[PDB]
């Protein structure tokens, strides 16, 4: 039942921008903080960004200033606007959910999407 | 059957409203666990260290309001790693009312911004693990709003970090400890 479906990935030139979409279903959207993670193969995993209705917004050090996370509460979808993309941002981008009443801003997500590939070339 | 030690951040980075919220958080945990077999002790830290009451002292005066109300904020830098070492060596000593064969819990309440400590977390966590101290972490303020402080919370938290990191704005940490202690 529980679904977290990433879309908006693909190939973009360096300096370009992408907007990922995390369309969610199968749970009450407002109970959860939703965040973005990424893992390129052979690289470590990173938290990127998170949005909670109570705890606000979080950005990693690489994400702050470039990236903007937002939420369409009517359609139960969370967007990550990524500007000034670089080749080192190439990774499989996962969206995830954490029960918002922990108040941790997506530190330990309870659900993970399948992930979508983001590729950044020169 | 359980000895729960508090280590509260009194450094300059802890605003007065949050430091209030720390005080009522700790008081509510003690107050919820009175009339049980839990003993309590508290250390405040910044760049200096104040034990506001030991395990023996809580045993002689088990009134959480009376013990927490006169606690005043120290301010200064953030010597978290040194604070961890002193709790394990001083608070969890049998001389201060701690019990040898008890369930040892350390509750650290901080914003996750160690600053000025001559010691690293890598130097103090093995000492905590050697005594079987389970470490719960309560993030306050903007602790969850920067990548540096979040990854710090895992380094301090116990081996399953997902069971041990919480926020002070709720009592989900207390429910987990209660469910833990009921399992024990
Ligand atoms: Mg500070």
């Amino acid at each position: 039942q529980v679904q977290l479906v990433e879309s908006g990935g693909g190939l973009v030139q360096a300096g370009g921008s992408l907007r990922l979409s995390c369309t969610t279903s199968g749970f009450t959207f407002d109970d959860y903080a939703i965040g973005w993670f990424r893992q390129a193969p052979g690289k470590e995993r990173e938290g990127v960004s998170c949005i909670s209705s109570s705890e606000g917004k979080y950005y990693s050090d690489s994400a702050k200033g470039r990236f903007t996370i937002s939420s369409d509460n009517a359609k139960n979808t969370v967007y990550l606007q990524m500007n000034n993309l670089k080749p080192e941002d190439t990774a499989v981008y996962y969206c995830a959910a954490e029960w918002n009443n922990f108040g941790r801003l997506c530190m330990y997500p309870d659900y993970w999407g399948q992930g979508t590939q983001v590729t950044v070339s020169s | 059957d359980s000895d729960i030690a508090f280590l509260i951040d009194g450094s300059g980075s802890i605003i007065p409203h949050d430091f209030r919220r720390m005080k009522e958080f700790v008081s509510t945990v003690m107050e919820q666990l009175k009339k049980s077999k839990t003993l309590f002790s508290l250390m405040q830290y910044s760049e200096e260290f104040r034990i506001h009451f030991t395990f023996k002292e809580f045993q002689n005066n088990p009134n959480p309001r009376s013990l927490v109300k006169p606690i005043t904020q120290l301010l200064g830098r953030t010597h978290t790693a040194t604070g961890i070492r002193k709790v394990v060596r001083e608070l969890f000593n049998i001389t201060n009312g701690a019990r040898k064969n008890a369930f040892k819990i350390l509750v650290v309440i901080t914003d996750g911004e160690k600053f000025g400590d001559p010691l690293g977390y890598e130097d103090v966590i093995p000492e905590a693990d050697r005594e079987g101290v389970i470490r719960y972490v309560i993030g306050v303020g903007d602790a969850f709003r920067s990548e540096k402080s979040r990854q710090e919370l895992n380094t301090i938290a116990s081996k399953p970090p997902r069971d041990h990191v919480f926020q002070v704005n709720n009592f989900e940490a207390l429910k987990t400890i209660q469910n833990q202690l009921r399992e024990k």
Side-chain angles (χ1 to χ4, degrees):
Chain A
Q1 187 69 20
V2 171
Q3 288 225 274
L4 302 165
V5 177
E6 296 88 342
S7 61
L11 176 69
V12 283
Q13 280 179 357
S17 306
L18 256 176
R19 181 170 262 232
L20 305 178
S21 298
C22 177
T23 314
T24 77
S25 66
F27 61 94
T28 308
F29 181 74
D30 302 329
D31 284 332
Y32 287 79
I34 292 92
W36 287 93
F37 291 78
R38 70 187 187 179
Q39 184 182 7
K43 305 287 285 182
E44 297 80 353
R45 297 157 182 74
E46 303 181 358
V48 181
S49 191
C50 177
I51 184 162
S52 161
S53 57
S54 52
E55 306 300 319
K57 306 188 178 180
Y58 160 71
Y59 296 104
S60 69
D61 288 4
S62 165
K64 181 59 175 81
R66 299 193 292 170
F67 293 1
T68 302
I69 191 166
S70 63
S71 173
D72 188 335
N73 300 324
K75 282 187 85 66
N76 302 342
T77 306
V78 169
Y79 305 98
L80 188 68
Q81 174 69 14
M82 290 190 294
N83 299 0
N84 193 32
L85 283 164
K86 306 177 184 298
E88 52 261 33
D89 299 310
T90 294
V92 178
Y93 281 72
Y94 298 87
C95 72
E98 180 174 68
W99 200 51
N100 186 52
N101 286 347
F102 294 122
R104 299 184 300 205
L105 283 162
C106 305
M107 275 190 78
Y108 306 106
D110 302 305
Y111 301 103
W112 299 89
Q114 284 186 345
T116 183
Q117 239 294 330
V118 173
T119 312
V120 184
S121 74
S122 57
Chain B
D1 281 319
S2 61
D3 299 336
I4 308 187
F6 293 103
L7 177 69
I8 63 174
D9 197 336
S11 63
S13 57
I14 305 300
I15 63 171
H17 170 81
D18 283 334
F19 195 73
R20 173 202 299 176
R21 187 62 184 90
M22 295 171 152
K23 286 170 65 170
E24 50 185 357
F25 178 88
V26 167
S27 295
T28 292
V29 169
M30 292 197 295
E31 197 76 27
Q32 283 294 287
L33 282 172
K34 79 192 180 190
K35 304 281 187 173
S36 77
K37 282 191 190 179
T38 305
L39 204 57
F40 291 103
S41 183
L42 183 142
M43 175 183 298
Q44 180 193 13
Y45 78 98
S46 61
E47 58 188 72
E48 47 186 347
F49 307 90
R50 282 170 66 181
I51 304 167
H52 290 284
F53 55 94
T54 64
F55 286 115
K56 184 183 177 184
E57 283 164 335
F58 174 82
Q59 185 168 2
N60 300 337
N61 186 19
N63 194 327
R65 172 186 168 92
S66 180
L67 291 167
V68 172
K69 182 64 192 179
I71 300 182
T72 59
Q73 193 170 349
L74 287 161
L75 308 180
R77 289 187 168 183
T78 310
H79 293 196
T80 308
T82 299
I84 292 163
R85 170 170 288 183
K86 292 179 76 71
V87 166
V88 175
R89 299 182 181 185
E90 303 188 35
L91 296 181
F92 284 113
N93 192 333
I94 59 178
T95 62
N96 284 318
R99 301 169 290 183
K100 49 175 189 174
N101 295 117
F103 196 58
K104 299 186 185 178
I105 299 178
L106 169 58
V107 178
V108 182
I109 315 181
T110 176
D111 57 3
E113 296 195 343
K114 176 175 76 176
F115 176 61
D117 201 331
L119 294 177
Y121 290 114
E122 320 92 15
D123 304 316
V124 303
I125 295 300
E127 176 162 21
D129 285 333
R130 181 57 179 83
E131 304 198 345
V133 176
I134 300 285
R135 300 171 302 282
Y136 285 83
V137 191
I138 310 302
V140 316
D142 308 334
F144 300 106
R145 293 181 174 117
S146 87
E147 181 70 0
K148 305 185 164 187
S149 55
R150 284 156 73 94
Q151 295 299 337
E152 184 164 316
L153 300 194
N154 292 349
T155 311
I156 185 172
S158 288
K159 281 144 290 176
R162 176 165 56 267
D163 294 343
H164 296 89
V165 182
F166 297 93
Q167 198 179 5
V168 78
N169 197 28
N170 55 73
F171 291 98
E172 280 292 332
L174 175 53
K175 305 182 191 178
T176 303
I177 294 175
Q178 282 170 333
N179 295 345
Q180 182 185 32
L181 268 44
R182 295 294 295 283
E183 169 59 22
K184 309 305 166 175

